[PDB]
Amino acid sequence: NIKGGVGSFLMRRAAPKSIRQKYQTGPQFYKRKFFQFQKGHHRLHRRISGVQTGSPTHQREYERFHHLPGDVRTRPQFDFTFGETRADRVMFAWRKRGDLQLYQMSGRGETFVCYRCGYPVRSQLVAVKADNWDYRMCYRCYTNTVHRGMENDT
Amino acid sequence: LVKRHKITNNQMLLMRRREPYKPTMKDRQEIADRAKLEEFERKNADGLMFVPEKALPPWQKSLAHNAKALGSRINFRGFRVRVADGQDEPGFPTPFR
Amino acid sequence: VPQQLKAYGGTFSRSVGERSNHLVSDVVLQSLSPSSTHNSPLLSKNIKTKTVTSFEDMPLYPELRSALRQLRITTPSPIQQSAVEVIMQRKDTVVAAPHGEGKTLAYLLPLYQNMIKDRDVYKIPLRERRPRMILLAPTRELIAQLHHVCSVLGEATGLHAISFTSRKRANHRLSRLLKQQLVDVMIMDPKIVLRLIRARRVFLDDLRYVAVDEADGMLSSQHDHDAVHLLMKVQKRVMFKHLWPVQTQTVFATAFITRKLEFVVGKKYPDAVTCIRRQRMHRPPGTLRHRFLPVEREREKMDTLQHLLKKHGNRPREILTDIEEEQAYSKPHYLSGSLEELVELDEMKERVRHALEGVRPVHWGHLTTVAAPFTCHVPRTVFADGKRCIIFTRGIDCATAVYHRLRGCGYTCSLLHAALPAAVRRRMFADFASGRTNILCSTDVAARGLDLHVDFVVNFDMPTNALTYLSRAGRTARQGRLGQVYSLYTKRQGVIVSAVRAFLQKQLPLEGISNWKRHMMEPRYAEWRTHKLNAIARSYVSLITQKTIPAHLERTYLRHNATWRPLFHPQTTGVHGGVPPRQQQRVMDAITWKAVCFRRGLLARRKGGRAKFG
RNA sequence: UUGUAUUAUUUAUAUAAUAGGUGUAUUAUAUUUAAAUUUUAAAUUUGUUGUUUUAUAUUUAGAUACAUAUUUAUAGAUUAAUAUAUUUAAAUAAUAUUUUAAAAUUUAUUGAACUGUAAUGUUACAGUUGUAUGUACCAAAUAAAUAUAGUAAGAUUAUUUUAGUUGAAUUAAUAAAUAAAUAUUUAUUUUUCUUUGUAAAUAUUAUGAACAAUUUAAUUAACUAAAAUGUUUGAAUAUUUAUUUUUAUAUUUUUAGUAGGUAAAUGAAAAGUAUAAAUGGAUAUAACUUAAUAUUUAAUAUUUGUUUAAUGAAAAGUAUUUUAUAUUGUAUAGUAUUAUUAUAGUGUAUAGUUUUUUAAAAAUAUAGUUAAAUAAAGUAUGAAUUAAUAUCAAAAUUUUAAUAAAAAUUAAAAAAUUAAAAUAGGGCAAGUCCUACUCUCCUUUACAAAGAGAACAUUAUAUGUAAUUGUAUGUUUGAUUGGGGCAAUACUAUAUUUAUUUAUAUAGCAUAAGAACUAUAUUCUUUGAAAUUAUAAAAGGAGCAGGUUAACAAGCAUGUGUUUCAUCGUCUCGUUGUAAAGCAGAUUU
Ligand SMILES: Nc1ncnc2c1ncn2[C@@H]1O[C@H](COP(=O)(O)OP(=O)(O)O)[C@@H](O)[C@H]1O
Ligand SMILES: [Mg+2]
Ligand SMILES: [Zn+2]
């Protein structure tokens, strides 16, 4: 046998196996090959964070993410705080912006993977598609989709 | 380490580059290269002067002198040794040629 | 026992600026990715990619239009589309193309247009020993081909082009040519051009155009930097002020762009435009097939070559008597035939040519054409059933050995290498080109830019570098003509053949490849870090999507599947496993304590409950 | 010692009344007017961290590149070589070069009381090694040594400073202006309204990106104060179309006073550098490797002496037998102890041959269904791992670069004692799976190379060769030691030929003596086919790496027949999705 030698780093150029993956033309349904994180992070997940400046009696939780644009600056349509504590911990829900609906939970952050960016995202804001929680979407791509008008076409 | 400097106001604290009015490293390289090229072109604006034997660098002067030694001791015009280390031909007419 | 904690056992490559920092430029290509282009001194500044999609759109004289009609060129290749505009704009240019997109025309036709403009509009006079254009090409065969391609244009446009090569009385012949016929274009080797300049047989007073056909070799040490010295002389002439202002422009046509070429052009001609298509640069054409044949031993290579020749139809002349063998060894046996005979075996003639040469439509962005007839100084005057072949060997000795072996076996072969005398070399090349010999055993002499009809290329010695291999491959896969390259390899070329095979299989450029297993295996620390980050991200995504884990395992799962843990000193990973010795020191202290306790217990068990006593 | 020999140099931790209350008294941290601020350091980490390692404390030990050259005094170059030498300097001086630490290897030596054999407890055999082991770390032990310490790592003693750039550079290899960055020393007054860090000598220089898109275009701060930053109306309410309500000022960084040389990193004593001799701070300074000491753990674990049925050697002890009772000698082992524990050879059987606390509980160890005993606290004695830590880290929420008691917000966290592993601490980039490469191992016909030996030459021991063998042993995928280009017959000129412009030759050249270092000009003294195989050869648990979102796919089967992959169909038939957002194996801590 004539055993050759070739490094994996050389082949990594052609890791993508589709147009969608190679050229990121559409949402990445858990098939993103190349990721661009910040130069100092170690846990490798995008962060959509919030800020708290007081107790709930002065600053409602949904107002924490007021520095970001989009629906998050509008008062959520449904509040699930006074009644009970839902198992998923979702405390606020916004009006459906198409087939997408935005939820906010009272937790440190749920590390999900959004099918548009394809990156793991750790945040309290989660956008779900047509009530199917198996397909979550982070707030950045949710806002971009709403801005572009692709609410029902992702 | 980073060169700390004595401050004269909080503006120096906010300042990052010690000389803001100075081009970054790449622009410095570009400007230096352009200046050197311009100086070289200005030097070469005139033709390539054919310097005499005595003006050649140290590593050509002695070789040329030894090559033409016999002609120097026996004086007769028309004697030229076609040495190899001499200055290369420019390719165009020049005022000094 | 030795160590029980590692971050990266292997060792990284010393290279920093690129994958092939240690290799010389003339042996490896240069990555064209934008990351490398950014630091590149040529590919970053100016790069022309917009295209004009018609010669009619291009401003050309009726003489040039008639010339290209004679040449059968009707649709511009993308390289021509990108390069004609800039060369007409009169900027120093670097044209790059994957071996058969039409670089010759791309850098000739605009230059001839400019020369006609100078001669007619500006009315610049023509002097005896002061040519307008100097064209440079390494090999004598390529010089002759360029002389033909320039003579057609000269006959069309009224210009005159000469070319010279080694002969019996080279000095006398060249001086006589210069004295007799004043010329507009001279196609010649840079060494001879420098000889003429130094002997002041030629002058740069009226020179306005410099063209280089193989910029890589010409600017590399492979050709003694003669082109570089000539270009420096041209720059000195341009700087010179007492003569009329000549904005001499340089065109570099190069099927490869390497470190040497890019650095020379970037550091000498800062305002040099570049015409490259990275998607198809440094790759073989799509109509080329590859077959890497292993051989158990070097002896089997001759049998494999005979098998390939027989398969493609170059049947040998069966030898059955001593006189037949003697005449086969002594005298050549040329083939004979005609177009009508082959057909039985001028639109109809063109269709027959397409069928014979395997020409297929060239599919470009939104337009298609058919490859024009080859441009060689020896037309295909003879046709035979067997397919044209070219066998590239390791050297002159191997070329001649294969030639004689095939002749003894019974094949009709020609030989081409530098050591042959001038007359024999001309006769051999003429035979192969005209078709009186369908097999040509040669060396890299014929691998450098020859436009000739060859059905397939055999590598009797698999090249160790991408440059020569890709040049030989491109010798056959022209504009759209089908091509096939076989390569007989051994254990020695295993690394290179595997790398090339993978690269061709997944259609990615041969930017950096070598025959050194360590070079092709050991990664470069930053590249390994990028790949590791991507792999960790993919593992994290898979873990998030598929697996659900409890709180007491979340920490460990994230640490071992979702965290980027940088190495301690990648330059010393081969020594300390990429882990700090201090942490390694603590780990080994604990493990050695445990091992000492276990060893004491084992000694007690084996000796009867007491180590010393038992 | 016929000078404490002389001269200089160095030097010990035995030892201890110290004070009866300045701050608070519902919880955040020195300067007392109450507040505010505050919550390690060093190295490592060049993706600069939340990674990594060290530090209980007191005192001490601890590491070497000469920051400077006064009259006698005088210093070139240069050719391959012969030779040539038109033609400007100088303070002739050498000795040194952190520190700790490599799996080391080398030399010499001992060990068979342990253990493993043979012999019948003892003898014999030992580190190119005896039979898993060879005296409580088997790459053994002892003695010597400062190996490429480098391409492991760590440490490295001198505050108040006084000047340039903060991501550039990168071309192996024939006549091409110039690598840059950082640091050290040093150099140049060139005109233009203003402004502008250029150059040389010298030292060092792997802190390392894969794609896509586009493009000749896109952690620093002198003090005081000042101070400018920051839930309806293309609907809603209503009925079978009408109603409704659609600027400023101010808050934290555009300034002075005073301190005060100058725009930040090469210690300071006029007191042994002694003439000085009773009131000289000569205060002149290593948080982690040394040594000693004092603490924490520690109100701790441990220890605890009220009950005895029974050996007459020797190696082994040497513990003061007052006189113990031929010559010579009687008692009191080993495991580091006054310890698990009879050392048993011989030999015998009624000598009671005499040291184990305590007034409960948990936990832990022992102890008439089916297939209840023993070990306490307390009095007394008194260890060990550990120890960056301010009197400390209730809790929740939110967030920052990997566990983050790190940050912020919110909130409200008492003290002691016992028990409990819930969290942190207590070594761990690991597990499985697929691919790839290599190692170990096997083999022989090739390579190197042993040693040994046969044979040969010369006349039972040797010298000189040594193609066999062994293959113990080390190798056996970097081929640019290639290819190209160069081809005597310059110069002026002539003739022939030409695969449609190549090819070939030749006519011309002797000789010449006064103006004295001398003028870019000349292609002439003579190479036209090296008929490959070097590179030793080859096969299939462990190590490293990749991938885990696999690999392959204008296919498959033997010209023909047939969609791909999958949704858990059915006994060929057939529904659905898909053309990848699809298909192997693994998915554990
Ligand atoms: N537009 C064109 N269309 C068809 N043939 C072309 C065209 N341009 C060049 N060629 C032909 O394609 C062949 C390769 O051209 P060439 O310039 O020699 O390749 P390269 O770019 O590698 O030098 C030649 O036969 C040439 O005549
Ligand atoms: Mg070409
Ligand atoms: Zn997203």
Question: DSSP states of B40-60 as a string?
Answer: HHHHTTS------GGGS-HHH
Helix (H, G, I), strand (E, B) or coil at C437: coil
> In the structure encoding, which two tokens stand for residue C94, read together?
């670097």
Query: Strands of A125-129's sheet, edge to edge?
Result: A78-79, A90-93, A100-105, A125-129, A132-137
Nearest to C193 by CA among C223, C152, C153: C223
Contacts 24+ apart (CB under 8 A), C594-598: C595/C1
Choose among C598, C602, C456: nearest CA to C1: C598
In chain A, after which residues does the backbone break, taking C–N over 2.5 angstroms as a break?
A: none
Helix residue ranges, H only, C158-246: 170-180, 190-198, 215-219, 226-239
List the determination method.
cryo-EM
Q: Which residues of C touch A2 (CB under 8 A)?
A: 294, 489-491, 494, 497
Q: Rg of chain B's alpha carbons, rounded to an integer?
A: 26
Give the gap in angstroms from C-alpha A75 to the nearest C-alpha of chain C. 30
**For residues A47-70, b (16+ Cβ closer than 10 Å) or e, as one string?**
ebebeeeeeeeeebbbbbbeebeb
C353 lines ligand 1 (CB under 6 A): no
Terminal CA-to-CA distance of chain A, rounded, Å? 50
Task: Pick from C60, C65, C77, C212 the residue to mutate for probing ligand 1's pocket: most ligand atoms within 8 Å of its CB.
Answer: C77
| Alpha-carbon torsion angle C445, C449, C452, C455, nearest 10 | 80
C chain contacts of residue B94, beta-carbon cutoff 8 Å: 240, 242
A23 to chain C nearest CA, in Å? 14
Q: How far apart are CA C150 and CA C160, in angstroms?
A: 8
Secondary structure, 3-state, C373-386: CCCCCCCCCCCCCC
Q: Nearest-CA neighbor of C356 among C388, C378, C334?
A: C388
**CA closest to C526 among chain A residues:** A9
User: Which residues, other chains included, contact C548 with Cβ-Cβ below 8 Å and sequence gap of 6+?
Assistant: none
Integer Cα distance of C408 and C403 in angstroms? 9
Count of residues in chain A: 154
| Residue C468 marked ligand-binding | no
Angle at A34 between CA A32 and CA A39, to 5 degrees: 130
CA of C609 to C1' of D144 (A): 37
Q: Which residues surround ligand 3, an ion (CB under 5 A)?
A: A 114, 116-117, 138, 141
Q: Which residues pair with C362 in a beta bridge?
A: C369
Our answer on whether the CB atom of C101 is closer than 6 Å to any ligand 1 atom is yes
Which subunits count as partners of chain C given 3+ CB pairs below 8 Å? A, B
How far apart CA C378 and CA C381 sit, in angstroms, is 8
| DSSP code for C579 | S
Cα C218 to ligand 2 centroid, rounded to whole Å: 13
CA–CA separation, A6 and A19 (whole Å): 25
Q: What is the Cβ-side half-sphere exposure of residue C377, based on CA atoms within 13 angstroms?
A: 18
CB-CB neighbors (< 8 A) of C198 in chain B: 88-89
Q: How far apart are CA C96 and CA A114, in angstroms?
A: 42
Nucleotide nearest to C519 (CA to C1'): D478
Residues in contact with C430: Cβ distance below 8 Å, sequence separation at least 6, in sequence order: C378
Instruction: Give first-to-last CA distance, chain C, whole Å.
Output: 26
Bridging pattern class, strands A132-137 and C209-212 = unpaired
Helix C322-330 with C396-409: angle, nearest 10 deg: 150
Nearest nucleotide, CA C225 to C1': D174
Q: How many CB pairs under 8 A join B and C?
A: 45
Q: Nearest Cβ partner of C540 from A2, A33, A120? A: A120
Strand D nucleotides where any atom sits below 7 Å of a protein CB: 44-54, 77-84, 86, 103, 114-115, 132-139, 151-154, 161-162, 164-178, 180-181, 183, 195-199, 206-217, 219-222, 231, 253-255, 263-265, 335, 397-404, 409-411, 423-424, 426-430, 436-438, 477-480, 482-493, 502-506, 516-524, 528-535, 537-540, 543-549, 551-553, 580-582, 586-589
What SS3 class is residue C488? strand
Distance of CA C357 to the CA centre of its chain: 23
Shortest Cα–Cα distance, B57 to chain C (Å)? 20
Buried b / exposed e over B19-44, threshold 16 CB at 10 Å, is eeeeeeeeeeeeeeeeeeeeeeeeeb
Shortest distance between the Cα of B89 and any Cα of chain C, in A, equals 5
Q: How far is the CA of A9 from the centre of ligand 3 (A)?
A: 27
In which element (H, E) is residue C163 found? strand C161-163
Surrounding ion ligand 2 within 5 Å at CB are C 103-104, 449
Q: Binding site annotation covers C222?
A: no
DSSP SS3 for B30:
helix
Alpha-carbon separation of residue C125 from A102, C132, C229 (angstroms): 79, 10, 27
Alpha carbon distances (Å) from B26 to B32, C37, C39, C41, C265 = 10, 15, 10, 12, 19
Strands A78-79 and A90-93: antiparallel
Phi and psi angles of residue C73, each rounded to the nearest 5 degrees, phi first? -85, 125
Q: Is C290 helix (H, G, I), strand (E, B) or coil?
A: strand
Measure B48 CA to D198 C1' (Å): 27
**Residue C72 counted as an annotated binding residue:** no
CB contact under 8 A, C562 and A33: no
The span from the CA of A60 to the CA of A102, in Å, is 16
Q: How far is Cα C352 from Cα C369, in angstroms, rounded to an integer?
A: 17
Q: Rounded to whole angstroms, how far apart are CA atoms C520 and A5? A: 6
Q: Cβ(C73) to ligand 1 under 6 A?
A: yes
CB-CB: which of B41, B44, B92 is closest to C203? Answer: B92
Among residues C289, C137, C295, the alpha carbon closest in space to that of C226 is found at C137
C570 lines ligand 1 (CB under 6 A): no
Q: Resolution, in Å, please?
A: 3.5
Rounded alpha-carbon distances, angstroms, from residue C409 to B1, C301, C310, C566: 75, 14, 12, 63
C38 Cβ under 8 Å from any chain B Cβ? no
Q: Please judge whether A3 and C538 are an interchain contact, meaning their C-beta atoms are less than 8 angstroms apart.
A: no
Residue A126: HSE in the Cβ half-sphere, 13 Å Cα cutoff: 29
**CB of C334 within 8 Å of any CB in chain A?**
no
Give yes or no for a contact between C134 and C209, defined as CB atoms under 8 angstroms apart: yes
Contact indicator for C8, C570 with CB cutoff of 8 Å: yes
At C170, list the tokens: 């080279």
Give the nucleotide at minimum CA-to-C1' distance from C189. Answer: D485
Handedness of CA C533, C539, C542, C543 (dihedral sign): negative
A141 is in an annotated binding site: yes
Chain C contact present for A108, CB below 8 A: no
Please write down the HEC assignment for all residues of chain A: CCCCCCCHHHHHHHCCCCHHHHCCCCCCCCCCCCCCCCCCCCCCCEEECCCCCCCCCCCCHHHHHHCCCCHHHCCCCEECCCCCCCCCCEEEECCCCCCEEEEEECCCCEEEECCCCCCEEEECEEEEECCEEEEEECHHHHHHHHHHCCCCCC
> Is C270 an interface residue toward B (CB < 8 Å)?
yes
Selection from C118, C95, C103, C113 nearest residue C157 by Cα: C113
Q: How far is the CA of C23 from the C1' of D209 (A)?
A: 20
d(CA C283, CA C302): 29
| Beta carbons within 8 Å of C470's beta carbon, 6+ residues apart | C99, C255, C256, C282, C284, C510
CA of C274 to the centre of ligand 1 (A): 19
C99 Cα: distance to centroid of ligand 1 (angstroms) = 9
Rg (CA), chain C: 31
Which stretches of C80-119 are assigned E, i.e. beta strand? Answer: 93-96
**Ligand 1 neighbourhood includes C481 CB (under 6 angstroms):** no
What is the biggest distance separating any 2 CA atoms in chain B, rounded to whole angstroms?
A: 81
Report how far ligand 1's centroid is from the alpha carbon of C265 (Å).
25
The alpha-carbon gap from C248 to the nearest alpha carbon of chain B, in Å, equals: 14
Question: Residue C495 — φ and ψ, nearest 5°?
Answer: -65, -50
Could you tell me the two tokens for B58? Answer: 């140290």
B92/C237 CB distance under 8 A: yes
- Rg of chain A taking only CA atoms, in angstroms: 19
Q: Which of C533, C554, C563, C567 should one mutate to test binding to chain A, selecting the residue with the greatest count of A CBs within 10 A?
A: C533
Query: Of C207, C142, C145, whose CA–CA distance to C447 is shortest?
Result: C142
